[PDB]
Design a protein around this ligand. Structure first.
Ligand SMILES: *[C@@H]1O[C@H](CO)[C@@H](O[C@@H]2O[C@H](CO)[C@@H](O[C@@H]3O[C@H](CO[C@H]4O[C@H](CO)[C@@H](O)[C@H](O[C@H]5O[C@H](CO)[C@@H](O)[C@H](O)[C@@H]5O)[C@@H]4O)[C@@H](O)[C@H](O[C@H]4O[C@H](CO)[C@@H](O)[C@H](O)[C@@H]4O)[C@@H]3O)[C@H](O)[C@H]2NC(C)=O)[C@H](O)[C@H]1NC(C)=O
Ligand SMILES: *[C@@H]1O[C@H](CO)[C@@H](O[C@@H]2O[C@H](CO)[C@@H](O[C@@H]3O[C@H](CO)[C@@H](O)[C@H](O[C@H]4O[C@H](CO)[C@@H](O)[C@H](O)[C@@H]4O)[C@@H]3O)[C@H](O)[C@H]2NC(C)=O)[C@H](O)[C@H]1NC(C)=O
Ligand SMILES: *[C@@H]1O[C@H](CO)[C@@H](O[C@@H]2O[C@H](CO)[C@@H](O)[C@H](O)[C@H]2NC(C)=O)[C@H](O)[C@H]1NC(C)=O
Ligand SMILES: *[C@@H]1O[C@H](CO)[C@@H](O)[C@H](O)[C@H]1NC(C)=O
Ligand SMILES: [Cu+2]
Ligand SMILES: [Cu+2]
Ligand SMILES: [Cu+2]
Ligand SMILES: [Cu+2]
Length: 499
């Protein structure tokens, strides 16, 4: 792992994770990029060096540190034209922030167009030397991070606007496309008798994945950086951008066992060993498993998750017992997504720069109809009713700068004002189940924070809004470095083909 103080060099390279060679966006030579790690309390100084040369995958870039509150450092959050102008090619920029009050499993990714889909994405872990779950496992390290990624043989800007699924699911950066079932698979080495904290991170641009391990159950103890009550399951459906820690007891027979991550669409199942990797106990031969999959009889259900430590829900025990309730009505017209009649188009001047330049009201802020001004020190409820009007369901919505209470989960008609799980990416379910997924949070974090579908192609088609939280305090609370002030002039000076 690198960090907390590190250079991250962004370049274009040839990679072949599934044996097919293509140009991708890589981080210190690799994709998924390297694990960034620190401890709770750390200051991170992550120097992002943009040495990109390929305009099709974008020569400019911007990195988001997914799940971090970034309190007082809203300028470092990453979304292009919300929190900064992109870094320009040939330049570097220092993201410099603290993580005083969080620990768990995160990730980092480009937040410029669909560039993370082209490879700029990797895992990010913040350890707790007082982790309340430490008694449950023996091993937690670089090799117990498990990444899932959808991989495409055509680049983001070159294929369909809304791809019908990936060529290959990669697990720790390797996997098979169904045409070449010879390509090397990832191996996750375990040792009989040891308990492992596996940190499962979905780096997905689009599909969700139903993750299982032949012969083993999984005890979930963390959900998107929030410590849970331990929950034993035999399969986990994990949506783009979500994270779970699970404990795996390596107390079965020394052998090879299939690791399975079946996407919701694209190449499904496991023929040829697609959608798979290998759990190899030490001593087992260097061969593919021959285990078979059994029916999941205890699948994860989000409603079954609860915080480890009692965490009151923001507001009061009633539908709309909050200071401000916002409903998000979805639409789609074949090319673009809309929220409450507005398809997001990034503004010329980043929302944060507009605020620092005096714009504190929805009337003054751009894009018009896409920015919701929130009062300070208030409870907020947001509902995302599933509708046939928004194909590509279930949409995993993400709120930057906050961890929220999921008061109503997909596939559940029930509202939990008592002990609902908190997380930062939530499936908004389907119109088939009449879902009306609802979240709550408190506005104690001044700044503009993106709220958007985490299917990158949908974000790109406009499926986003901005929550402009406590705009009158943004300037005082988030002092900006000169390097940040320099971004927009430099970017705006670029030829459009060097963007
Ligand atoms: C900027 O980044 C973008 C996004 O990735 C790059 O876009 C690529 O554009 C090229 C050229 O326009 C496209 O090439 C097409 O590629 C396909 C598939 O190619 C792959 O499969 C081959 C078959 O086995 C194999 O030879 C290739 O290997 C080479 O390429 C890789 C990757 O760079 C390299 O690592 C290797 O060393 C090899 O050099 C590769 O694995 C190919 O089939 C296409 O050909 C049909 O296409 C044309 C028109 O129909 C025709 O002339 C041919 O007869 C052929 O039948 C074509 O060459 C490519 O698909 C794009 N990549 C992606 C992921 O979308 C762009 O290249 C980058 N620019 C720079 C400067 O690198
Ligand atoms: C992961 O979780 C799943 C679900 O919780 C769990 O599956 C359960 O496994 C047990 C294995 O103990 C299954 O029950 C067995 O079923 C067989 C077939 O009917 C019976 O013959 C077994 O009886 C023998 O073994 C018992 C000990 O448990 C003796 O008490 C008994 O007298 C017999 O000798 C036994 O009942 C159970 O049905 C499943 N439940 C399902 C599928 O819902 C699985 O074991 C867990 N995996 C791991 C590795 O922990
Ligand atoms: C999903 O829940 C939201 C939030 O409760 C609902 O929107 C509210 O509906 C009632 C109408 O009976 C209004 O009084 C509230 O003011 C609404 N909030 C709005 C529109 O901002 C929504 O109706 C529910 N939708 C579905 C499909 O169940
Ligand atoms: C969908 O709406 C967008 C944004 O308003 C518009 O520019 C686009 O042309 C529309 N597309 C179709 C297919 O109607
Ligand atoms: Cu994200
Ligand atoms: Cu985020
Ligand atoms: Cu979506
Ligand atoms: Cu985001």
């Amino acid at each position: 792992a690198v960090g907390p103080v590190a250079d991250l060099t962004i370049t274009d390279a040839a990679v072949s994770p599934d044996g097919f060679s293509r140009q991708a966006v890589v981080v210190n030579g690799v994709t998924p990029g390297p694990l960034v790690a620190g401890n709770i309390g750390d200051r991170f100084q992550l120097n992002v060096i943009d040495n990109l040369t390929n305009h099709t995958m974008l020569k400019s870039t911007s990195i988001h540190w997914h799940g971090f509150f970034q309190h007082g450092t809203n300028w470092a959050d990453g979304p292009a034209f919300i929190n900064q102008c992109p870094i320009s090619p040939g330049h570097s920029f220092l993201y410099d922030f603290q993580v005083p009050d969080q620990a768990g499993t995160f990730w980092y990714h480009s937040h410029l167009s669909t560039q993370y889909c082209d490879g700029l994405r990797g895992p990010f872990v913040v350890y707790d030397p007082n982790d309340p779950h430490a008694s449950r496992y023996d091993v937690d390290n670089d090799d117990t991070v498990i990444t899932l990624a959808d991989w495409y043989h055509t680049a983001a800007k070159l294929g369909p606007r809304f791809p019908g699924g990936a060529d290959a699911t990669l697990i720790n950066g390797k996997g098979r496309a169904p045409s070449d079932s010879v390509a090397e698979l990832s191996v996750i080495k375990v040792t009989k008798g040891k308990r492992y904290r596996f940190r499962l991170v979905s780096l997905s641009c689009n599909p969700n994945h139903t993750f299982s391990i032949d012969g083993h159950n999984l005890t979930i103890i963390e959900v998107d950086s929030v410590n849970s009550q331990p929950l034993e399951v035999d399969s986990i459906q994990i949506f783009a951008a979500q994270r779970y820690s699970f404990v795996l007891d390596a107390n079965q027979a020394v052998d090879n066992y299939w690791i399975r991550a079946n996407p919701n669409f694209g190449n499904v199942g496991f023929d040829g060993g697609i959608n798979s990797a290998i759990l190899r106990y030490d001593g087992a031969p260097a061969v593919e498993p021959t285990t078979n999959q059994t029916t999941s009889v205890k699948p994860l259900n989000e409603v079954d998750l609860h915080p480890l430590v009692s965490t009151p829900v923001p507001g009061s025990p009633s539908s709309g017992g909050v200071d401000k309730a916002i409903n998000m009505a979805f639409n789609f017209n074949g090319s673009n997504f809309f929220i409450n009649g507005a398809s997001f188009v990034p503004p010329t001047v980043p929302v944060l720069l507009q605020i620092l330049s005096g714009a504190q009201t929805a009337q003054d802020l751009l894009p018009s109809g896409s920015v919701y001004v929130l009062p300070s020190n208030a409870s907020i409820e947001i509902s995302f009713p599933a509708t046939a009007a928004a194909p590509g369901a279930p949409h995993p919505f993400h709120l930057h700068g906050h961890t929220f209470a999921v008061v109503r989960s997909a596939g559940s008609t029930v509202y939990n004002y008592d002990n609902p799980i908190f997380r930062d990416v939530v499936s908004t379910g389907t119109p088939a189940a009449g879902d009306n997924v609802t979240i709550r949070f408190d506005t104690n974090n001044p700044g503009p924070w993106f709220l958007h579908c985490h299917i990158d192609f949908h974000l790109e088609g406009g499926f986003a809004v901005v929550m402009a939280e406590d705009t009158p305090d943004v300037k005082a609370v988030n002092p900006v470095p000169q390097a940040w002030s320099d971004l927009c002039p430099t970017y705006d000076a670029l030829d459009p083909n060097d963007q």
